[PDB]
Design a protein around this nucleic acid. Structure first.
Lengths: 24, 144, 129, 140, 150, 260
RNA sequence: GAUAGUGGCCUACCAUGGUUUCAACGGGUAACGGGGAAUAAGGGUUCGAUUCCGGAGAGGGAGCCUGAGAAACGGCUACCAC
RNA sequence: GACUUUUACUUUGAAAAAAUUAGAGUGUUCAAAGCAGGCGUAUUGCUCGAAUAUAUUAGCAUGGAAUAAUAGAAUAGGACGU
């Protein structure tokens, strides 16, 4: 079905940026 | 000779053998993969705060029949729904719903023999107030 | 194949002492073995012994008295410095009172107390007590 | 061939008078590199021109005097030597093999083949990767 | 013991303790050296020559009676072959097994034994290529083996 | 750093200043001048910490702004002026003279000097060279540049300099069997006689020295300074005479200087 | 050529090299590096943002004036986001 | 000047910032600390201190020649010659 995931420094920082922006 | 090399120019094989065999431990594999930073509900912290969504009458059947008093919480830092035990209050009279709760860890290993659960967390504070001093009647709880 | 010879020699010596015998036949021989047994013979863990020539590499017949408890080799010959001796004599000997960790220094092969007195060091072969 | 380039190959400031005709068609400069390293014969009597020579160039030798073993000679006027050694891990109380390559300039007063043991000496930065220069050769 | 097999077989010649010449042997050193040269020009290998010298002529060991071995003497006379004897017999046996495999395509056992023999050839050829008794251009190949034996 | 520094934190001080680590937060960073930063001694430390004349920092400033303190004949007005080895400090109103000589423990010590000895000053020649219009000159350990030396003066030669005119009075060439003080490194502050000179071309040279009590030690050539002859130093030596003692000898001497 | 100065640092013209199971290259880091910290009979295990040294940055990128020294944010200029 | 198998391994010395560590001294009232202080005629002042130790690998210098590598006249294209 679906393959796995391997996240970057980039993917961490962009998802954290999106969540921080939505929180603020 | 004990199934491992003993040559004096063989430090490389020994340390590669150790780095391959330390992945069979438990604490090493949790620790160097960032397990707690990804999936554990506290995110690798000693406490957490959250908002009570429900009070739960969980049941422990066998071999001890008891009515476990628990609380389903949604944590503030994560958006994570976690059930947790609350001790010493038969009435839960210090707890209502939609209150803020400081939770810690709790090491009860529930059994598989009678589907009795050990939830992972105990309630330390409700609405800022020490739950112990509530139950020991040393403070009063502001009720919102 | 046969990689160390002093190891096989002390293996045979120790087995024959465990059985309580009086003599051993070591095949082959080495200069290192002869010097080692001279170190043994100086304190007298063994009596006299004897070389045998066959033009190839000699055999040795050893008379062993009763005094050997255990001898052995340290098979990777570790480099040791001066204070490092105090590690190995804390590991291998049965007491601080006796026993001889033996070293191979540039001034010959001898027990550790002589290398304390001569103030040298080197590598390590084995232990006798 | 000496004059292989788009520019004239000469030593700098070394002048041959057209009026006074000498026996040799070029007066030629050389020097010793010190530390008791003997200059070779083909440096003195040869006809090559090398900026980066330690004997006929503007390059001194000072710092680290090292040895090594040639691996490649596939590239123009410089080679790659490979010096290897033993690194000590203290936990297992023992050693392991480890090597490094070094690109090093070689003067054309030397003929050097793969496998030879070469003594080199440190000079100033010659290229992106080179900081050494061949000062003595021992044949395998 | 016994690479490419499992046996622990010990069966060899002893060598007597006496270095020097036998007491009862009463021939000349040049006589037996000329005998060696005669049998070499006959076309024999040094193993065969030593066998015939101790069977018929009572010459016990070549390095006992003379100061040189048989191979030193054939090297001193310009009679050494292009390859040493053991590598030659290994290539000969490999050519035999190769021809047998070219006839019968199903003998997996001959295939396995051929692989073992070629392994032994490569190890011994690395030894001879190291000590410069064989040129570094030399390499065991199939049609090269058919040229070298046939 | 985006430019040259101006501070020196109190833990980063040279340990041979003996500054306490809880007085304040900094140490006086010595200025540019005749000595190296690491091995200098600024005037504030010599007035306050060793001679006890000034209690504060600004008392140092008050004394130095009255022109009492002369460093090698000239009046200095700097709080952190790098007074270093072999230098002469003169207090006119106190009528005292000091030569900065290392103690055996490796720090500068107080050392009283007569007026005749205060007139001159030694210095290790660190480079000799031929400057413009072909005039030879020497450069000493403190940065003094003297034109027209004796041609026999080579590198490492100790030169006597009379502080009035600043000329070369006489000199000592670096020969084996001379009296030698030691300038840097572990063996600092000892007085001995050099056995010979070990020579490593392309690297560092070494010197074997043998003291008054026949102990032998080895330093590099940089740390060497020549004073005089056997029993004939050109300057007056401090007490202890650069003789390195074991701790048991020192302990026995201390309890032997205790007899009520 | 440029630089304070070697140097593919860059440019023109030539070659076809260079690194790699003694682990290159890619990936991850809740990785600033070290002096050090905690804990042990020994050997080790785990931390070091944090008082000292060195590095880097002043919302993100870039460029620069002045000056011995800055690609400076309690200096300037432009874009991007507020 | 000409010579001039070498390395691995050990011995010693120098090198290894202070702070921290171990440890010497010292009645901070004791201590954790600090590097102070101690004596007299205290009336015109004497006075010891602020040690020592820690290759932990890389580099440097030196002694050793056991151990473990490698080479050294085999088509002689070998060696010492007043």
């Amino acid at each position: 079905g679906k393959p796995d995931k391997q996240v970057s420094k980039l993917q961490r920082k962009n998802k954290a940026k999106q969540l921080r922006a939505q929180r603020i | 000779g004990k199934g491992k090399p003993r040559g004096l120019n063989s430090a490389r094989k020994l340390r590669v053998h150790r780095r391959n065999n330390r992945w069979a431990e438990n604490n090493y594999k949790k620790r160097l993969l960032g397990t707690a930073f990804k999936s554990s509900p506290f995110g690798g912290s000693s406490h957490a705060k959250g908002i009570v969504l429900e009070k739960l009458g969980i049941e422990s059947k066998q071999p001890n029949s008891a009515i476990r008093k628990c609380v389903r919480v949604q944590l503030i830092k994560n958006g994570k729904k976690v059930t947790a035990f609350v001790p010493n209050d038969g009435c839960l009279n210090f707890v209502d719903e939609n209150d803020e709760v400081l939770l810690a860890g709790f090491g009860r290993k529930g059994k598989a023999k009678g589907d009795i659960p050990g939830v992972r967390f105990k309630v330390v504070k409700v609405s800022g107030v020490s739950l112990l001093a509530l139950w020991k009647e040393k403070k009063e709880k502001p009720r919102s | 194949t046969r990689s160390s010879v002093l190891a096989d020699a002390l293996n045979a010596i120790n087995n024959a002492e465990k059985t309580g015998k009086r003599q051993v036949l070591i095949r082959p021989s080495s200069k290192v073995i002869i010097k080692f047994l001279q170190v043994m013979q100086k304190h007298g863990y063994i009596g006299e012994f004897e070389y045998i020539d066959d033009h190839r590499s000699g055999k040795i017949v050893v008379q062993l008295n009763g005094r050997l408890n255990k001898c052995g080799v340290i098979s990777p010959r570790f480099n040791v410095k001066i204070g490092d001796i105090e590690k190995w004599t804390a590991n291998l000997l049965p007491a601080r009172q006796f026993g001889y960790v033996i070293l191979t220094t540039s001034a010959g092969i001898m027990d550790h107390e002589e290398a304390r007195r001569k103030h040298v060091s080197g590598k390590i072969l084995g232990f006798v007590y | 061939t000496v004059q292989s380039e788009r520019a004239f190959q000469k030593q700098p400031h070394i002048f041959n008078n057209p009026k006074v005709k000498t026996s040799k068609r070029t007066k030629r400069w050389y020097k010793n590199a010190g530390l008791g390293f003997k200059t070779p014969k083909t440096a003195i009597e040869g006809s090559y021109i090398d900026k980066k020579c330690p004997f006929t160039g503007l390059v001194s030798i000072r710092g680290k005097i090292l040895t090594g073993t040639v691996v490649s000679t596939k590239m123009h006027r410089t080679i790659v030597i490979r010096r290897a050694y033993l690194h000590y891990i203290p936990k297992y109380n023992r050693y392991e093999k480890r090597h490094k390559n070094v690109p090093v300039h070689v003067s054309p007063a030397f003929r050097v083949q793969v496998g030879d043991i070469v003594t080199v000496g440190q000079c100033r930065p010659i290229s992106k990767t080179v900081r050494f220069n061949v000062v003595k050769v021992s044949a395998a | 013991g016994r690479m490419h097999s499992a046996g622990k077989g010990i069966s060899s010649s002893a060598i007597p303790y006496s270095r020097n010449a036998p007491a009862w042997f009463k021939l000349s050193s040049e006589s037996v050296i000329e005998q060696i040269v005669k049998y070499a020009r006959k076309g024999l290998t040094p193993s065969q020559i030593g066998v015939l010298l101790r069977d018929a002529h009572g010459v016990t060991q070549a390095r006992v009676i003379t100061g040189n071995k048989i191979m030193r003497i054939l090297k001193s006379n310009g009679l050494a072959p292009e390859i040493p004897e053991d590598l030659y017999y290994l290539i000969k046996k490999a050519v035999s097994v190769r021809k047998h495999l070219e006839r019968n395509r199903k003998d997996k056992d001959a295939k396995f034994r051929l692989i073992l023999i070629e392994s032994r050839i490569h190890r011994l050829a690395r030894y001879y290529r190291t000590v410069a008794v064989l040129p570094p251009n030399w390499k065991y190949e199939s049609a090269t083996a058919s040229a070298l034996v046939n | 750093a985006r430019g040259p520094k101006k501070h020196l934190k109190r833990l980063a001080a040279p340990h041979h200043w003996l500054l306490d680590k809880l007085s304040g937060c900094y140490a006086p960073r010595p200025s540019a001048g005749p000595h190296k930063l690491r091995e200098s001694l600024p005037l504030i430390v010599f007035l306050r910490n060793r001679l006890k004349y000034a209690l504060n920092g600004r008392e140092v400033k008050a004394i130095l702004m009255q022109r009492h303190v002369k460093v090698d004949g000239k009046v200095r007005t700097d709080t952190t002026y790098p007074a270093g080895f072999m230098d002469v400090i003169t207090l006119d109103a106190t009528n005292e003279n000091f030569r900065l000589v290392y103690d055996v423990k490796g720090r500068f010590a107080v050392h009283r000097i007569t007026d005749e000895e205060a007139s001159y000053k030694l210095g290790k020649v660190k480079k000799v060279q031929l400057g413009k219009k072909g005039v030879p000159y020497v450069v000493t350990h403190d940065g003094r540049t003297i034109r027209y030396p004796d041609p026999n003066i080579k590198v490492n030669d100790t030169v006597k300099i009379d502080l009035a005119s600043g000329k070369i009075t006489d000199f000592i060439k670096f020969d084996a069997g001379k009296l030698v003080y030691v300038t840097g490194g572990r063996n600092l502050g000892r007085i001995g006689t050099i056995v010979h000179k070990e020579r490593h071309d392309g690297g560092f040279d070494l010197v074997h020295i043998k003291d008054s009590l026949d102990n032998t030690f080895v330093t590099r050539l940089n740390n060497v300074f020549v004073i005089g002859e056997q029993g004939k130093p050109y300057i007056s030596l401090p007490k202890g005479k650069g003789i390195k003692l074991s701790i048991a000898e020192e302990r026995d001497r201390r309890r032997a200087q205790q007899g009520l």
